[PDB]
Amino acid sequence: ENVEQHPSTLSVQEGDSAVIKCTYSDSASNYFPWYKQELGKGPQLIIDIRSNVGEKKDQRIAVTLNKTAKHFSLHITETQPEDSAVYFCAASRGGAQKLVFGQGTRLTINPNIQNPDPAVYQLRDSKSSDKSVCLFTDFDSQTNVSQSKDSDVYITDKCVLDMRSMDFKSNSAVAWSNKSDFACANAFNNSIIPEDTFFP
Amino acid sequence: FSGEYIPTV
Amino acid sequence: DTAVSQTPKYLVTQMGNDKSIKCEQNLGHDTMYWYKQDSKKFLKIMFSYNNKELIINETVPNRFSPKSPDKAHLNLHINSLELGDSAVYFCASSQLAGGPLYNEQFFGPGTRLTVLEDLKNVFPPEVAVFEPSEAEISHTQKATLVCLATGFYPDHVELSWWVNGKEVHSGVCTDPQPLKEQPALNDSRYALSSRLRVSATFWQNPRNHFRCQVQFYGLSENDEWTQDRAKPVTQIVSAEAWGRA
Amino acid sequence: GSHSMRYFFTSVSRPGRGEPRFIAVGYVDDTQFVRFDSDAASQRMEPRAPWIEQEGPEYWDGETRKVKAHSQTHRVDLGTLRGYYNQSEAGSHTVQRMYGCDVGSDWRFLRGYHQYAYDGKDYIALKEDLRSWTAADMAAQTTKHKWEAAHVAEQLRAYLEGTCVEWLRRYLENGKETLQRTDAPKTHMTHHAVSDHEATLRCWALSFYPAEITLTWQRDGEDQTQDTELVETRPAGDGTFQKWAAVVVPSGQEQRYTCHVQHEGLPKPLTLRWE
Amino acid sequence: MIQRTPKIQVYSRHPAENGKSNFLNCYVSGFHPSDIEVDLLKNGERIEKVEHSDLSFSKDWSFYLLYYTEFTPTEKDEYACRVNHVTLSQPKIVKWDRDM
């Protein structure tokens, strides 16, 4: 009646390996599928295991079953930016019986960054609605962004867009506020890159 | 015991 | 082509109301299912139906009442609502038979449902687009537009970039989840950000039209909007910009 | 010295009147030792032999779950098979399933079984080697392939070659005394005339376990089946069994037609006649 | 959709001695389908404390059942087994016999 999914979240570089390990508590289960849930959408079967076969592999993903010990694992070798999702492992007894899901794992495949040209630019509008907003773009994968210590300065989380025509990926974060006291120069709390960030 | 697995015709 | 479809998309009402959800598949399947996925993404099977015949039942708060008319349709009427029904309900369908030979369950897009104590704290979003700074246009010869969709409740939005009357995906990145504008509260509105990066040259051409367009899902054509307020009807909130030199 | 575990499953569809009726029974050799009846109240697997009563809660919780799951499956099948054969949803139908394992005097795996039947007729079944299938008709043909591809055998077999047999051993020794007894036939003979000058001769076998027994009537050097009328071995309800064989005979040579009674538990085979 | 009709056998657990306690067995076998109606009779009258076995079947998938009751037999008393089926025109009634 229980399945343990570990870990809850997981970050991996665009090259490395991602392994999620699951433990079911039933021992008469004999079916173990993994579900990919992209973004609040319908979960989708990527791979399942029946027979006994202690390894089922399909291109860049593979499953292990060590059923005596009551555990099974998803391996994402060959990671990529698309691989980012929430992964769910399930166990059932086959046939007309219930699948049991783990808590699911939140997988981020941090991308390999270009030629990191980090910077904090400031944009303005066309305006009704206040603000300027500040953009901390281009930086490399090894920068983490934390939030403000303001109630009125809004900073979003790191994010990756892929200009697909020019094989170019780039990170960024947004930061906006009300303050006549705002400005991008120190708008970001955190540990930026060393700080090359071009600050025009 | 009795079967832990059973197929569906 | 073929799929597991499920209406409505989103839905929002308040305590002790009555709402019904439908679902359908033309995959030609034996079985159909209902799962509740709660606040923290945990899936729990609720019911199932093999050929009109109900199999899985788990526990029946018998407010919760399934109904499967034929093999291809499967509905759930929920009565006297809960703040804890605030979940996403997933139709699915599998095919039992031959083993089952084909084990995978096919999911629908889910019907998102948030139920409130009080609908007056519902608001549609304000949408701002911001034209790229000329700073990065020199230093990189690329142009990031930023869209801000803000002050909305509940979290029922779908943001998209339209460039020259076609919907754009390349160069786009949208915040994975919103920020709460006051992380202190229960009633807090939300704020979402998005990013369209284009060629600097593309930006520098005012025959080029950028639209950030956010779908809000709100109140329908039956409620009780009593106030000096819009009435957060399901609606769209757009905002535009043009290229410069 | 041979032994066996054998589970028996019958689910029969009640159109309009709720779920299907579902009866499951377990046997070691010729003792029944567990049962399940859906119409029964307890809705658990039940003992029918003392040596199994020994078994703790998890065994019984466990066996209750699996046998319920057996019917859910049978229930699905019932529809599936309506499909396969193109049948009104208004008729009733019967699904039967029996499997099990045989061991020798060494208590090692000998044989395996797993057979299936729609409306009391062969459908598909597991072949002697526990790896391929025999389908009896066009419908089961469908199911064969699907099972072959779905790797059904590979699992059933691990049960039948392994967990089935492990347990059959476990049972045999925990039920040390009931299962390995050898109750030999209490025989006699009877005379009924009919006729007036021929006469029927009836050789009786009683209180014997297990149910395997041979009753022959004879030449007086060896055998006869002109009219050796013989009836199905039948249960007494105390755990033992009964049978008889009969010959109608000319009236004054009753004294050269003997009856032979072979059975386990008899040291030497019994010859029996009416002086 | 096949149909086998029940073969019937009426007899007692142990030998039939008047005045001491025995069991009156009715063994239906070789039939299909599983639905069957079986009663035991004392001088034409229906007996109520009548149990039956759990349903099972043969090598050929035909069903078998044992209906049984506790009775002390007598000179006067005649016992009988009544069995109705889908395969049967009218109920078939079979009388007990101490020597069959």
Tell me, yes or no, whether D125 lies in a domain.
yes
Tell me the CB-side half-sphere exposure of residue A128, using CA atoms within 13 A.
Answer: 4
- Last residue of one domain, picked from the residues D119, D153, D181: D181
**First CA to last CA across chain E, in angstroms?**
34
Q: Do C139 and A131 touch (CB under 8 A)?
A: no
Nearest to C99 among D72, D79, D147 (CB): D147
A99: amino acid identity, one letter: L
Q: Do B5 and A96 touch (CB under 8 A)?
A: no
How far is residue A151's CA from residue C85's CA, in Å, rounded to a whole number? 31
Chain A residues 90-119 with a CB less than 8 Å from chain B: 93-96
Q: What is the DSSP string of A114-158?
A: SS---EEEEEB-SSSS---EEEEES--TT------S-SSEEE---
Domain chopping of chain A, boundaries: 2-110, 112-200
Whether A171 and A138 have beta carbons less than 8 Å apart is answered as: yes
How far is residue A175's CA from residue A166's CA, in Å, rounded to a whole number? 26
Q: What is the 3-state secondary structure (H, E, C) of chain C?
A: CCCEEEECCCCEEECCCEEEEEEEECCCCCEEEEEEECCCCCEEEEEEEECCEECCCCCCCCCCEEECCCCCECEEEEECCCHHHCEEEEEEEECCCCCCCCCCCEECCCEEEEEECCHHHCECCEEEEEECCHHHHHHHCEEEEEEEEEEEECCCEEEEEEECCEEECCCEEECCCCEECCCCCCCCCEEEEEEEEEEHHHHCCCCCEEEEEEEECCECCCCCCCCCCCCCECEEEEEEEECCC
Rg (CA), chain E: 14
Q: Do D122 and E68 touch (CB under 8 A)?
A: no
From the CA of B5, how many Å to the nearest CA of chain D? Answer: 7
How far is residue A158's CA from residue D153's CA, in Å, rounded to a whole number? 51
Residue B6: closest C-alpha in chain C: C99
Q: Do C170 and A165 touch (CB under 8 A)?
A: yes
Domain chopping of chain C, boundaries: 4-117, 120-242
**First CA to last CA across chain A, in angstroms?**
59
Split into its structural domains, chain E has a count of 1
C120: amino acid identity, one letter: K
Burial of D271 (0-12, 13-18, 19+ CB in 10 A): exposed
> Are both D150 and D199 inside the same structural domain?
no
* D249-268 burial: b if 16+ Cβ within 10 Å, else e: beeeebeebbbbbebeeeee
Token representation of residue D42: 């307890």
Whether C108 and C82 have beta carbons less than 8 Å apart is answered as: no
Nearest to A95 among D73, D154, D158 (CB): D73
CATH architecture of the domain covering A2-110: Sandwich (2.60)
How far is residue D123's CA from residue D99's CA, in Å, rounded to a whole number? 14
Mutate to test the interface with D, among C56, C58, C96, C104 (most CBs of D within 10 A): C96
Chain centre distance of CA D243:
16
Q: Do A200 and C126 touch (CB under 8 A)?
A: no
How far is residue D31's CA from residue C229's CA, in Å, rounded to a whole number? 79
> Which residue segment(s) compose the domain that D247 sits in?
182-270
* Method used experimentally: X-ray
Q: What is the 3-state secondary structure (H, E, C) of chain D?
A: CCEEEEEEEEEECCCCCCCCEEEEEEEECCEEEEEEECCCCCCCCEECCHHHHCCCHHHHHHHHHHHHHHHHHHHHHHHHHHHHHCCCCCCCCEEEEEEEEEECCCCCEEEEEEEEEECCEEEEEECCCCCCEEECCHHHHHHHHHHHHHCCHHHHHHHHHHHHHHHHHHHHHHCHHHHCCCECCCCEEEEECCCCCEEEEEEEEEEEECCCEEEEECCCCCCCCCCCEECCCEECCCCCEEEEEEEEEECCCHHHCCEEEEECCCCCCEEECCC
Tell me, yes or no, whether D207 lies in a domain.
yes
Contacts for C150 with CB less than 8 Å, ≥ 6 apart:
C125, C126, C127, C128, C181, C189, C190, C191, C192
Residue C167: Cβ within 10 Å count: 11
Angle between helices D57-85 and D138-150 (to 10 degrees): 130
> Are both D167 and D89 inside the same structural domain?
yes
Nearest to A30 among D66, D75, D155 (CB): D155
Whether D32 and D49 have beta carbons less than 8 Å apart is answered as: yes
Rounded-to-10 torsion of CA A135, A141, A143, A145: 50
Which of C146, C165, C131 has its CA nearest to residue C243? Answer: C131
Chain D positions in Cβ-Cβ contact with residue E28 (cut-off 8 Å): none
Split into its structural domains, chain D has a count of 2
Q: Do C99 and D150 touch (CB under 8 A)?
A: yes
How far is residue E92's CA from residue E9's CA, in Å, rounded to a whole number? 12
- In this complex, how many residue pairs, one in chain B and one in chain D, have their CB atoms less than 8 Å apart? 47
Residue with tokens 């849930």: A37
C34: amino acid identity, one letter: W
Tell me which CATH code domain C120-242 carries: 2.60.40.10
> Are both D56 and D138 inside the same structural domain?
yes
> Are both D208 and D105 inside the same structural domain?
no
Q: Tell me yes or no: is domain A112-200 CATH 3.30.360.10.
A: no
User: Do chain B and D touch: 3 or more Cβ pairs under 8 angstroms?
Assistant: yes
> Are both D34 and D155 inside the same structural domain?
yes
CA distances to A163, C158, C161, C172, C198 from C201, in Å? 14, 28, 18, 17, 8
Q: Do D151 and A30 touch (CB under 8 A)?
A: no
CATH class given for the domain over C4-117: mainly beta
Which of A112, A173, A159 has its CA nearest to residue C172? Answer: A159
Q: Do C55 and D150 touch (CB under 8 A)?
A: no
CA distances to C22, C96, C167, D153 from B4, in Å? 35, 17, 52, 13
Q: Do D155 and A28 touch (CB under 8 A)?
A: no
Which of D216, A92, A151 has its CA nearest to residue C94? Answer: A92
Residue C37: Cβ within 10 Å count: 21
Question: What are the backbone dihedrals phi and psi of residue C137, each rounded to the nearest 5 degrees, phi first?
Answer: -65, -35
CA distances to A180, C176, C213, E46 from A123, in Å? 15, 22, 19, 97
Whether A84 and A33 have beta carbons less than 8 Å apart is answered as: no
A68: amino acid identity, one letter: T
Which of C28, C46, C27, C26 has its CA nearest to residue C36? Answer: C46
Tell me, yes or no, whether D275 lies in a domain.
no
Question: What are the backbone dihedrals phi and psi of residue D73, each rounded to the nearest 5 degrees, phi first?
Answer: -60, -50
The CATH number of residue E79's host domain is 2.60.40.10
Same fold, A2-110 and A112-200: yes
> Are both D106 and D225 inside the same structural domain?
no
Which of A123, D259, A137, A160 has its CA nearest to residue C146? Answer: A123
How far is residue D264's CA from residue E8's CA, in Å, rounded to a whole number? 27
Resolution in angstroms for this experimental structure?
A: 3.0
Nearest to B8 among A28, A93, A95 (CB): A95
How far is residue D184's CA from residue D241's CA, in Å, rounded to a whole number? 10
Cα angle for residues D175, D178, D184 (degrees, 5° grid): 150
- Last residue of one domain, picked from the residues D126, D160, D181: D181
> Which residue segment(s) compose the domain that E21 sits in?
1-100
Mutate to test the interface with A, among C39, C105, C174, C192 (most CBs of A within 10 A): C105
Task: Indicate the pairing of strand E63-71 with strand C4-7.
Answer: unpaired
Cα angle for residues A88, A91, A92 (degrees, 5° grid): 135
Residue D210: Cβ within 10 Å count: 21
Token representation of residue E69: 């009751």
The CATH number of residue D261's host domain is 2.60.40.10
Q: Do D66 and B7 touch (CB under 8 A)?
A: no
Task: Indicate the pairing of strand A133-137 with strand C190-199.
Answer: unpaired
Whether E93 and E42 have beta carbons less than 8 Å apart is answered as: no
Which of D169, D157, D167 has its CA nearest to residue D113? Answer: D157
Cα angle for residues D162, D165, D169 (degrees, 5° grid): 135
Chain A positions in Cβ-Cβ contact with residue C29 (cut-off 8 Å): none
